[PDB]
């Protein structure tokens, strides 16, 4: 409807991912992962094979995949520490250290 | 002390740091930091992982039976999508 | 258990200093009990069933 009425193109990732703000939490992390892997400052070329073959864009896919896996393990280290605070002895200082 | 060096020096691609990497994410994260894109001919090939070698390694040199796809489908989707094999990840996710 | 410490971090200290043979079932029963009393505080159902 937004294309037909000429409007600004919406982010289709946020339209689809809000269907994963419902029940299945694994589909919710799957859409979070898809979104972090489409967070890419693409070269606006008329060729997908040249953009997917770029050295810069393939560095960006790995830079995002590492950021996703790092925030994933940051969520795991947060949840593990907040469940076990009496062992963990977190105190009162914020930061990953 | 091994794992931190194998990351920072992009070396020992044939070690998996399995005393430190608990899970499939940690294999992905180890090997993804070990990636090069660049033909620096001073790198010996026994230390040289490209993204395209790692893409093939997951899709063809391990495959759908290695990741137990029928029981953990989102983990194999994670393995393909975090290696930017988006078309293979869709042609997997459009089966089940 | 009350103050929500893990009993592995006292059973394995008792086992060097109590019956010097196979001090075992005191620790198994204590851990079975720790898991049962932690199940009284766990609100995620599938993990209480775990």
């Amino acid at each position: 409807e937004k294309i037909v009425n000429g409007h600004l193109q919406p982010n289709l990732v946020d339209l689809c991912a809000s269907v994963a703000e419902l029940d299945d939490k694994s589909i919710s992390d799957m859409w979070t992962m898809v979104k972090q892997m489409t967070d890419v400052l693409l070269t606006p070329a008329t060729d997908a094979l040249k953009n997917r073959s770029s050295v810069e864009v393939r560095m960006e896919f790995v830079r995002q995949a590492l950021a996703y896996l790092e925030q994933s393990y940051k969520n795991y280290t947060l949840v593990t520490v907040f469940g076990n605070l009496h062992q963990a002895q977190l105190g009162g200082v914020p930061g990953t250290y | 002390k091994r794992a931190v060096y194998c990351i920072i020096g992009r070396c020992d691609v044939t070690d998996n740091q399995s005393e430190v990497a608990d899970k499939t994410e940690d294999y992905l994260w180890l090997k993804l930091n070990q990636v090069c894109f660049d033909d620096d001919g001073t790198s010996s090939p026994q230390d040289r992982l490209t993204l395209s070698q790692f893409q093939k390694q997951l899709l063809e040199d391990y495959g759908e039976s290695h990741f137990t796809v029928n029981q953990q489908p989102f983990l194999y989707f994670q393995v393909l999508f975090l290696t930017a094999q988006f078309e293979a990840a869709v042609a997997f996710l459009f089966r089940m | 258990i009350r103050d929500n410490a893990a009993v592995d971090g006292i059973s394995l200290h008792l086992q060097d200093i109590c019956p010097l043979l196979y001090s075992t079932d005191d620790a198994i029963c204590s851990k079975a009990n720790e898991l049962l009393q932690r199940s009284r505080q766990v609100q995620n159902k599938t993990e209480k069933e775990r």
């Binding site: 939490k25 | 899970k23 940690d26 992905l28 290695h66 137990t68 983990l75 | -």
Partner: peptide, 24 residues
């Protein structure tokens, strides 16, 4: 010898994330 493990970061967590809650 060289192979991936076959586990996610959430298996030894059993109940993860922000979801699986019946009301806000």
């Amino acid at each position: 010898s060289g192979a991936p493990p076959v586990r996610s970061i959430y298996d030894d967590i059993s109940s993860p994330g922000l979801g699986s809650t019946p009301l806000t």
